[PDB]
Structure formats: C-alpha cells, structure tokens
C-alpha cells in the first residue's frame, strides 16, 4: 500500500457491484434527448458554450470506464476494502458544514471538478520523486485509492447526488489531500515487529476456538493453531495435507458428470 | 546518558564495529602483566596479605581500601586485569580441539602444504568457489580421499615461465600422511596401511599437541589464507594453548562468612588445582625419571583445563569438585539457561521501577494513573538545574525527602552525591546553577506502565502519574481491555523514565491516547465497557427523561463545559430533557454516523439503528454497537477526526456523565 | 619546523550555543592544541587561525547534550628526527655532558659524544669545556647531529653527537 | 561510506516524521535542561520540555536531522523546513 | 507449490493459508502484516522456515545470531574465522548499549548554526578602558599573502 | 619500525609536508600574533613554549626584516627536498664539500659552482 | 559493623521484651564472633522494614548442639485496605476498590447498609447462579 | 529491588520505536558502566581516568584511544571470552 496500517478505514466501491445498465445511469452524460443537468447547472448554464465541455464528459467516462472493467479482472467479487482516508465521510459531514439542499443548485462547473482531482490526486504523492520512471512506482502505488476518487467525484455524481459548491468542494479536496499525507507511514520504523506481534495475537484467538467445544466433525478437517507450526516449519508431514481441485464446467456444472 | 566520573579524556565515540578474533599465545602474554607461579595461591603465604601471582599482581582490587595500582578506584570503575599463566607443557583444548581434529589433512605432516595440487584444478577451484568459513567442506572431502603425497611442488620441468611455468604436479612433494584418524573418547587414534608387508588399523597409535602446533607454525603464509583462516586474527597455530590467560576476579566471585572465614568459588578453585598439576610436572623437566610415568600426570592437565571449559564434553570425565558434582565451567554460565544469555543480556531486571495490585477508578482522565505517595516518595527522575527552576526547585529540597513535594539526593559538578537523608538534612547549600538534583514524582510527569505478559504493541503505554493515596495503582476502566487483565488482584509494573530525552519519546509517540487504535486491525482497542456501557443503553433510551433538577447536577462533567445550559426538549407542563440530548453533549461537534442496522424503516421504527449529526444524536440507542471497538465505530470515528482529544476527553465525558447518571439510577441483578 | 594541517574535535556545551559559537569553537581550539606536543607531530607551536580554519559538523550527542565540532586547522609544529642538524643554545655545562636547547625541545649532548679535544674545566670561572682555544660555556650555540630521538608521554627526547665534521662551536 | 546529498536535490518527504518530532523534542529538552540559549520568548514555563514544545510550534528551534539513506548518503533538514 | 508453480505463486499460497488460520471465525485481520510475513518467507528464493530460533539463515555475522540463541558453538566456531559484524543488527546493537536504529534511532541530529547566525537582528571601538586598541578591523594590516609567499 | 635518519627517510606525511623556514617561520608567527591582538584585553599568556621560541627565533634571525625573507625566497626556487631547502637556509656557510657533509642526501642531487654563487648572495644579504 | 539500628530496644540480655512497639529495620537480637579494639563481629538478624507492630512473645531454650537458642514472635494487626483480596465460595475473586463511610452507602430501607457490594457484571458470563441462591 | 524487563517486554518498545527509552532501560538504568578500548586491538586498557594515563602493554599505545559504553554485563562476557582465547576486538570508528 505504502500507508500506515493504523490510520485506515475499510471503505466501499459503489462503482463495482453495479449493473452496466445502472452504471450508465450514474456517471454517463450526453446531449441525446437528455440535458437534465441544466436544471442544476444553476446558477449559470452557458449554455453548452462551444465544444470542450461536451468532450470532457466522454473523456471522464473513458477512464471511469477503464476502471469498471479492471477491476474486476483483478478482484473476485468483494467490494469492501480498507483504504486510507474515509472519503464517503469527508462529504458527510461536509453537507453539514455548508448544507445547501436540492433547492440550491451548484455554483460549480463541470470543467472544475475534473481539474479539481487531477490537481489533487497528483498531490497525493508517496514516492519521491522525479526522477522519471520513479514516478511509476507512485502512479500505481496509489492506483487503487485513485479509482475511488473518480467514482465518488466523477461529474454526474457531484451534481445529481449531493450538490456541491466551489467552497465546499474546494474544502473537501482539502481534507482529503491532508488526511492522506497524514496517513503515509514512517520512515522509521519497524513494520515487521509490530506486524509480527499482531499476527501472533490472532492465532491465539483461533487456537482456542478451533478446539473450544466443538466436536466432532468430518471432511475438510484440518484445525487451526495446532497447524500454524506446521506451516512455519514447512514440515512434510502436515497431518491434513488436503488439497482442493476445481473443474470447468464442463466438467462439470452437473453432478453425474462430475 | 548520565555521568561516569567525568572521565572526559578519550572523547567517547561509541562502538561501531566488533572484530571477532582468536586470542594468541604471544598476545595473551603481552596483554597480561602478571606472573602466576604460586599455583595454590589464595594468599597462602601464612598471613592475610597476598602474592605472588593470584590476588595482587595486580590485579584489579576486591575491596574499598585498595587502589590496585594501574587504575581505580574500587570496587567498580576498575575492570579485571587479565594475566597469562605460562605453561611449558603442550596442553589440549576441547572446543577448538574438535575443529583442529576435523582438519587433519589440510597440510599433511609435516611439510605442511595444502593437500590439493592445482591440481586437480577443479577440486581446489571448487573449494574456493565458496565464501570463507565454509570451504571447509571441500577440505574434509579431500582428506577422506587423501592419504599420500607425490613429487615435489609444481617446479617447472620442463623449466620455463612466460607466462609459466606448468610446470608443476603436484601438491608439492613429500609422502604424507597416508594414515586417517578417528575419535575415541578424549584420545586420537589412527591406522597406517599401504600396503602388504606390515601396518596398523583401528586399535591404537596416538599423536600429541606439541607436534601438531609445530607443523602448523611451519604452514606457508599464502597457505594460511588458502583456507578459512586468518593470518592476522585466526591462526591454526593458535588452537593450542601455551600461555593460558587468567581473567581478573571481577569475572569471578568470593565471599566471607564474616568473621573467621572467607571461602571463594568454586569454581575458580579448580584453576588453582591445575597449576598444582603443572608446577609438579614442570619441575621434572630435568628428568629423566621415571619419564614414562611422567606422562600419566601430564594427562591430568589435559582433563582439568578441559573441565574448566566444558564440564561434560561427552566423554565421561566427571569433573567432581564437591560431592561429585560438575565443576561450574565457563560454558555453563554463557548458555545456561539460568544465567547470562537470556537473563543478563536479553531480559535484565532494572531499577527506577515498581509494581503493585491494580484497582479501578472512574474519575481519572484516560491518560491518567493514580500513583500512591508511598511510591512517589521513592522514585526519580533526576532533572538538571535550569535557571528557570533554581527557586522553585530549591523549595523541594528544603522540604525533605519525606514530604511528597520533596526530594532525595543533590548532585554536584564533581559528581558527588549529597544524600538528603541522615547525611545532609541541613546546610542551606543554596543550590548551584548548573548541577543536578533528584526530586520525587508529582504530576504527569509521564511514566510507562505495562502488564506481563505483554503481547500487543500497547501492553506498555504511557500515562501521567499523580498521585493519590492507598497502596494500589488506580487506572482507567476503559483501558483494561488492552491489558487483558481484570482486578483479580493483578499486579502491573511501572517504569519511570529518567533522561529528558526519553520522557519525550513516551509522550509524543506512546500515549494511552495515541494508542487507542492499533494498526493490527486499523480498529480501536479501547472502548466504553462494563458498567458505564450497561449504563449507556439504560439512559440513551427515549423512555428516560431528565428532571430540570439536574441535568444541572450532571452538567458539571464534560469536563470542558460551554457554560451554556442545553435548550430543553420539553416545554410542556414540566420541563424535561431527553436522555439522548444531554448525552450527545459529550460528543464532539461535527461527526456524522449512519449506522443502519438490520430491520429499519422510513419510520423509527422503534429506536432501531443509530445516527448522529452536528455532534448530536437523534436516532436509535447507544450500546456496544457504537461505543465499543466497532469497525466504523463511534470511538473510531473521532480519532481520526479530530485526533486524540477532545478525543481523549470522550472517554472522560461519557465514562463520567453516565457513571454519574447510573449512580442515582441504580442497577443490579 | 613545519606548517601542516591537523584535526581536532571540540565538544561544546549547550551553555555556549549563543549566536557567536564560531568564535567560541575557535577560542577553545587555540587553547587545547597550542603548546601541546605529540610524538607523531611534535610541538604544536601555534595555529594559523583565520582563513586557514575550517569548521565542519556538527552532530549533537544523544546522552550528553554536547555537540562535537570537527575542526581542520593549519599549525606551525616543531618535530625533530634522527640525523637532522640544528643550531642549539647551550644552557648548562656539567662534567656529564652539554645541556643545550633548541626552541622548545631539550637536547642532551652526552660527554662521551664530545670530541676528546674539549677537556672539562670546573675550576675555570664558569664551568666550561675548552680545548683547544674554542671555549663552549653557558652561552655558545653549538651544532649537533641528532643520533636518536624518543617520545615518552607526548614529550620528545633525543641524543645528539659532535663526532662528525663541521659540528660543534658556532 | 557516506556520500552527502544536494541541499537542492532532496528526495525524502518534506514532512516531519512521527519519530523525529519525538527525537527533536527529546533533544532540545536535554539542551535547555542543561541551561541553554532558549530561542523563543519564555512564556513563563518550568518544564525543559513543555518549553521545547513552545519552540517547535513556532519552528524556532535549532537542531537539524541527517537522514541516512541505504546507499550511505544523507540529507539534512531544518526544523523550519519540515512539516 | 514452489516445485511445480512459481515462487511468486507460493507467496500467494502462504497469504491464503494464513488467512484460513486466523479468520474463522471473527478475526483481527490486517492484509499488511500478513503481507509482510509472506515476503520475508519468499524473499530469498527457498522457503525459509521460522522454527524456534529465527530463519536458519546466517549472513549477519555471529554477534547477531548469538541473540537468537542458543549462543556458544556459534562463538566457539565463528571465533575460529574472525567474522566481521557490521553491527547493522538491532539485537546485536541492544547488546553493546550503542543507541539502536529502532525507528527513533534511525537518524542523527546536528545544529542549524545558520539560523543562530543570521538570526533576526540586531560596534568598532577599543579605548573605553582596555589599554589595547582596535578599530573594527581596518587600521592598515593584511595577512595571507605573506603566508603564501 | 621507522627510526632512521637518512638520507631523506621517515614518516610519509611529514616527508610530504614542507619544512617551514626559521626567519620566515618567525615572521609568520609575528603576523599571527598581530591578527590575534586585533581586539585583546591585554595579557595572553605565552606559556613556556613561546618564550623558548621567542629567544631561539631572535637568536637565529637569518633575516631580521620583512623583505629579507622575500629576498631569500627570490634567491631560492627549485624545491629539491623541502627539508634540504629549509636546512640550507637555516645553516648557511658555505662551500660545497661542506654542503654534502651536512646534507649527505645531496650526493648527486646538485652540482657545485651554483652552490657557491648562492652562498655569496646570502653572505651579502 | 552495623548501623541504622537501633539496638536501644534490646535488654541487658541482648533480646527484646514483649511487647515493645517495634517498627522499621529495628533489631531484636544481637550476635558476636571473635576474630584493639578487636574483635567483635555482628551476625545478628534485623527486621524487614516491610513489617511492623509489637512483639507477641520470645522463647529462649537450649539446643544440642550445646548452646543457646532463641525464638522471637511479633504480631501485627492487619485491617482491610483498598487493594486487599476477597472472594466468596464460588470463585468470585474480588479486590476492594473503595471504602465508602456509612452515609454514602445505599441506606435502605429497613434500613440496613451493605457490608460489601459486588457488581452485577460478575454474574451472567461467569454463570454462577449458586452465589445468588446462597 | 529490582524489577524485571522481559524479552517479551523489550520487543514492545521496538514496535513503537523508542531507541532512547530502550537504550535507557537496559544500558543505563541497570548497568551504567564505562570502559576505555585500545584503537588497534579493541580491548580493556590500563585506564585511570584521573592522571590521563592509559598506556597499552601490547600494541604499545599511549596516544590513540577511544571510550566505550558497555554493560558490566557485556564486560563479563568479553572477559569470559578471554579465558577461551578469543578476542572480541571492538574496532570503533576510524580509530580502527
């Protein structure tokens, strides 16, 4: 990750377990019998001015879309993962600090929120510096944290859901930047000692349970703690040597074929 | 770092590298400045003096009234003065002996020239294709296949060199060698065959030390390096002892049944027994007679100088000193256990510490720890004399070491301790303006508190003393989870820092506050638990209204009160306050939560779920779900916005407000 | 005499951090090295303070509160070596030899290392060693050829002879 | 084998580390505790450290930090520089 | 798995096989520390076990090992070879009392004399008693030059 | 280890260094003192080492002047052997044969004629 | 040698007389072992400071051996103080946390006052319904 | 006294990261012991810390020296090693 375990909050990717059909109904935008946002563009529409805007809107989604396909292609199905800096919260409370309800439409501009990020994701650096190519380890040492910030701050999102204004948004992207760099671990430090200790406590919590009471059982048998030593000892004789093999199907998805 | 007789002199420069070498007879002699000819020394001169070659010369002193020339004073500050113990009787050496035995075939006797040739270019090259201290494997393999010599070195023939000559073959010249060896008890035996005319197998035929050493010394310098040896630190010709060194008493022990008596250890003693067996062997040098019987007593030095190292080298020696019991060797102390290694180098007792039974207290801030005066009156905690202290700091001394707000000891320029006890107890002795003075402890004043067994990062975290009475450690209930230990009469240790540079570490990094969230799980590790928790539920209910009558009373905890009395939720006939109202008071301003539990509807539907706004709850009911180490836990959420404190105050408010509510709400089963 | 570059560490104390440390460090250096002697470099006549005074570092001590300031300086030193010819100033004359004196170092000319033409006269007004018109009293710089030098306790001491040609009274 | 690094081309993080704060405050504490030239208007304190903290807040405290790299090179940072 | 898949493969195997040890059920998991244990195991090729002693390695001299216990032999053998210990160790280090590189000991400190020098503001006399004179420093005198000559 | 006389032999660092001159050395010392006095209260203990030097230096003033030294420098030039140089300017007088005797290391280092010319210039200086 | 007595509490017999208020590192017996002004040693036993209180009684008899033989016993009342252990007969290991005077405690309504009061959370988890029944 | 600072215990400072607390509660608050080491062969000298007399009857040293902080704990071991004919040379900084 690059971050200090201790400053982190499991988070959720709205943009994942979503049907493509509803995905489009959250981020994508067009002039095709739509133009519903103009009802929010208040105050000030343009309107539509000259190109540019129409173009930013499909370019945002080119990348918000290269993120929907990958993941997956990497993550099984789960969605809850632990990231640094609770974003889902910096926005509430944030709609407490400034409030403003649907009645007040956004004093923002689609050409700002998109610059907003690009300027304040590139402020989230943890590997310094450039030193060309050394900017690569960094571009994707935060790549995950990144797809969040294009999913909870992509355009259609900030005007349909939770209308923001220059001041609010400018302050949101404030805390993020700050809470991020305040979450970068070390140097120091001792990441093994502390980590090792935490790994020991967990085992102790299992050992007992894996035995507690507790039967009595069959198949899949293996046990916990009592096994640990087996793994660390890489010993050949590991009681339950088990091994799980999957299939296709076919074969199979059936049964009698299996 | 403290003081140490303002040695000054040789600046300081901390140890940076550690060079592990192999003592050498020559060096051992030079280093030592004593003799040691009175084997059965022990001041056995007929009086209570000493000499010559045991106690005195010099050596390092053993009591006060003594300035053992060379340094001082005593008993400390004066390290032991090692000394040589001649010999003149080729002695063995178990430990290093094992290795020397394995070698056999690394030079062949006596020409002393690496076995390999050139060579055989693979064998020799292969052995080198491995870092030092390992190539041994190759040597051993060659010895097992060796047992004969050849021509004579690689001397041209034909003679030439440009670039030559090769001109060689092989492995020098001589013969051998030719006889292997095996280990039988504490003796070496080997057979000599060819053959087919007369030889010997495995039955007898020993060797000796004087012979081996001689062969080694002859070893070629470019040869000493060819193997895992060091022609500067480690030299085979060193494996054999000749000037056996003698550590200073400082390393040994003594005793004195004051009076009449004063036996020693024990131990050592044996050392004297060895010189007894050496001086009786050295004097016979002019003989001669019986000669063949003289070797029988020589075998005894082979055993004693061993028992002194490895009591039981797996041979069946006994090494009985008193009542047939192993003779406390040197290898015994090292890797006990029950000694150094894991008792004098890893886990050392220590000082400026204390421990006692713990007790609960609901009235201390989280980062607070009740320290009984009994202890506070015995700690410290030096503290140099600042120009800001002189007046304040002086009052302490003039007070006394028996009055909490007092001190013990006053340290001066020269490094002299003016014990405030019986010693001082007077002498205005104003107070220097650069010296040091040791005070009692008083008000956080941080100090670190742990619980054996300390698994988690936070079994040692740092509190702020002060200072209560009664002889236990009062500590804060919400801090009990991290110490996985109740009040079953448990003990917990306290370690007080001294230097003002650690006082800083355990304040800025380690602190009950900055430790309320271990990264083990990026989840909190402390939370509202026990009675203050049971209480929250039974009070966060919207069935519980508060009489105007207090409210008031309970508002005196917060502890940082706006001063403003909360706007009443009920203006009907009586003025009433909801239990959620005044509770949401002790939560920070501007933290949001949308708990959304199982069944939950646009409705209430029935205090189900939980949800806070500008630091005020409005929805559902507080329980462990939210004021315990939960994931998106309320405890987690202000920590983490906005850091410990008012964060640290959260535990003080609820754990103070509610306890206060519960006091007059009563609860039981 | 040599003009060389030497090193020395100054261990300063918090009390003297002020805003003019540089001065303190320099003042402390002059005091610790000037007048000292070593077998390695000899007598440290004086330090060429100013311009030729480098002040690097420094790193404060963990358990001490004092910072170590390494200093590179140019100094005038007087180191003698066996075989060197020097002019000396006779101080005393006893039937034991000639207690000369060169600069700050003391040179002893054993009587056995003096020509057989210089008989010792104790009756003469002021004990001297004449011959041989040439009269060497407690006021006549002589030329000697260091035969051997020694260094016991930073201090240096060697013996000179008068056996070679062109040595003796000056 | 050191190497020293350019006060102009610094690599490491511009912010002051959890551990450093702890070491600096530890270091000045001892310094002042040892009667030393205090670099900010004395608020009227007593605690050689609680004072050092008054300094840190105003970034008016001496001492610099040499950050050794694995290479063997280092970087020097000024308390007023750091964050 | 190391013999028949990848070495990288086998790391993932550990990570997975450790999760399945401390998770069922309800267990304090952090992907970070789990991650680290694995990389340490599969970071030198072969599968370095962690038996009561500490990865049966040997590349940091003895001094260090002597800490993992049991000492003895180690020193009795290493001595016969003069094994240099860069003392870059952390237990080797807490053995000598030198300050250890434990995070907050993994850096040194000096002094920003520069600040004390130019420090906020803020003359040339010598006759108010001190028989000696002065005048700032320009009464007609040089230096160097002569030295160079 | 190294305790010879030579013949130019001994410590390497010292060998490398250039042997300061007598008169010139004293001049430099004087200069140094002048720079120090530039703002002194009065006194400045000269210890014991100073006294001796102050005497020997004055009793060997082979150039009681600020220019004498420069003249000497001008006259010289070719290094040859720092030691030998400072030695030749510290002894003086006079003939070749004598030069070799005092500095045997000069053997086949330099000729004669030249030497004589230098001595004459010094005597007149 | 021996300081921080005081031996001012020993009789002519070199032994203490009950029941003399003994505290601190006070001493109670005195020894002597031969070796100007020489020589008398001191192999006498003091009293651990951690203890206090008076002296119940002493018994001086003869051993064989063939010399004298003394035994000293001192009593030291001990009151309950915060931090002392108590537990019922069901494994309710408890320790004292506080000592409220009579008024504070829930005087009710009979009205008596609890002599000690344990907390309800030491029930449901340690299922010890016997403590209740009793 | 005293108390007891377990292996367990020490492994926990390291987790936080307290170089100085650690060093304080092991090489100061228990065995505050200082010794003087020869720069060539790193061993105990004939030190006096009074008359500045150090000297070395072996390496023949009298000018080249350095000081070291070690626990009398350490001290013993190095000494106990001398009896086994092995020399832990404490080659300090450049003083090597």
From Swiss-Prot, chain B:
Keywords, in A-Z order: DNA-binding, DNA-directed RNA polymerase, Isopeptide bond, Magnesium, Metal-binding, Nucleotidyltransferase, Nucleus, Phosphoprotein, Repeat, Transcription, Transferase, Ubl conjugation, Zinc
Chief place where the protein resides: nucleus
Signal peptide (from-to): none
Domain of life: Eukaryota
Residues that coordinate or bind Mg(2+) 2: 486, 488
Recorded GO CC terms: chromatin; mitochondrion; nucleus; RNA polymerase II, core complex; RNA polymerase II, holoenzyme
PTM: The tandem 7 residues repeats in the C-terminal domain (CTD) can be highly phosphorylated. The phosphorylation activates Pol II. Phosphorylation occurs mainly at residues 'Ser-2' and 'Ser-5' of the heptapeptide repeat. The phosphorylation state is believed to result from the balanced action of site-specific CTD kinases and phosphatase, and a 'CTD code' that specifies the position of Pol II within the transcription cycle has been proposed.
Chain positions recorded as Zn(2+) 2 binding sites: 108, 111, 149, 174
One MF annotation (Gene Ontology) recorded for this entry: DNA binding
Gene Ontology process terms (BP): 7-methylguanosine mRNA capping; co-transcriptional lncRNA 3' end processing, cleavage and polyadenylation pathway; intracellular phosphate ion homeostasis; termination of RNA polymerase II transcription; transcription by RNA polymerase II; transcription elongation by RNA polymerase II; transcription initiation at RNA polymerase II promoter
Keyword Signal recorded: no
Disulfide topology: none
Subcellular location: Nucleus
Binding-site list for Zn(2+) 1: 68, 71, 78, 81
Annotated positions binding Mg(2+) 1: 486, 488, 490
Record's subunit section: Component of the RNA polymerase II (Pol II) complex consisting of 12 subunits.
Gene: rpb1
Swiss-Prot record, chain E:
Compartment(s) of residence: Nucleus
Phosphoserine sites (modified residues): 143
Posttranslational mods: The tandem 7 residues repeats in the C-terminal domain (CTD) can be highly phosphorylated. The phosphorylation activates Pol II. Phosphorylation occurs mainly at residues 'Ser-2' and 'Ser-5' of the heptapeptide repeat. The phosphorylation state is believed to result from the balanced action of site-specific CTD kinases and phosphatase, and a 'CTD code' that specifies the position of Pol II within the transcription cycle has been proposed.
Subunit description: Component of the RNA polymerase II (Pol II) complex consisting of 12 subunits.
Domain notes: The C-terminal domain (CTD) serves as a platform for assembly of factors that regulate transcription initiation, elongation, termination and mRNA processing.
Family named by the database record: Belongs to the RNA polymerase beta' chain family.
Function (record text): DNA-dependent RNA polymerase catalyzes the transcription of DNA into RNA using the four ribonucleoside triphosphates as substrates. Largest and catalytic component of RNA polymerase II which synthesizes mRNA precursors and many functional non-coding RNAs. Forms the polymerase active center together with the second largest subunit. Pol II is the central component of the basal RNA polymerase II transcription machinery. It is composed of mobile elements that move relative to each other.
Gene transcribed to yield this protein: rpb1
Swiss-Prot record, chain F:
InterPro entries: HRDC-like_sf (IPR010997), RNA_pol_Rpb4/RPC9_core (IPR006590), Rpb4-like (IPR045222), Rpb4/RPC9 (IPR005574), Rpb4/RPC9_sf (IPR038324)
Family affiliation: Belongs to the eukaryotic RPB4 RNA polymerase subunit family.
Record-level GO cellular component terms: nucleus; RNA polymerase II, core complex; RNA polymerase II, holoenzyme
Localization annotation: Nucleus
Organism: Schizosaccharomyces pombe (strain 972 / ATCC 24843) (Fission yeast)
Coiled-coil intervals, chain numbering: none
Record keywords, A-Z: DNA-directed RNA polymerase, Nucleus, Transcription
Complex formation: Component of the RNA polymerase II (Pol II) complex consisting of 12 subunits. RPB4 and RPB7 form a Pol II subcomplex.
Function statement: DNA-dependent RNA polymerase catalyzes the transcription of DNA into RNA using the four ribonucleoside triphosphates as substrates. Component of RNA polymerase II which synthesizes mRNA precursors and many functional non-coding RNAs. Pol II is the central component of the basal RNA polymerase II transcription machinery. It is composed of mobile elements that move relative to each other. RPB4 is part of a subcomplex with RPB7 that binds to a pocket formed by RPB1, RPB2 and RPB6 at the base of the clamp element.
Lineage start: Eukaryota, Fungi, Dikarya, Ascomycota, Taphrinomycotina
Main localization of the protein described in the UniProt heading: nucleus
Pfam family, one: RNA_pol_Rpb4
The encoding gene: rpb4
Gene3D superfamilies in UniProt: 1.20.1250.40
Protein name: DNA-directed RNA polymerase II subunit rpb4
One GO MF term attached to the UniProt entry: translation initiation factor binding
From Swiss-Prot, chain G:
Subcellular location: Nucleus
SS bond partners: none
Family of this protein: Belongs to the RNA polymerase beta chain family.
Additional note from the record: The binding of ribonucleoside triphosphate to the RNA polymerase II transcribing complex probably involves a two-step mechanism. The initial binding seems to occur at the entry (E) site and involves a magnesium ion coordinated by three conserved aspartate residues of the two largest RNA Pol II subunits.
Function: DNA-dependent RNA polymerase catalyzes the transcription of DNA into RNA using the four ribonucleoside triphosphates as substrates. Second largest component of RNA polymerase II which synthesizes mRNA precursors and many functional non-coding RNAs. Proposed to contribute to the polymerase catalytic activity and forms the polymerase active center together with the largest subunit. Pol II is the central component of the basal RNA polymerase II transcription machinery. It is composed of mobile elements that move relative to each other.
Oligomeric form and interacting partners: Component of the RNA polymerase II (Pol II) complex consisting of 12 subunits.
Name assigned to this protein: DNA-directed RNA polymerase II subunit RPB2
Included range, full protein: 873 to 1017 of 1210
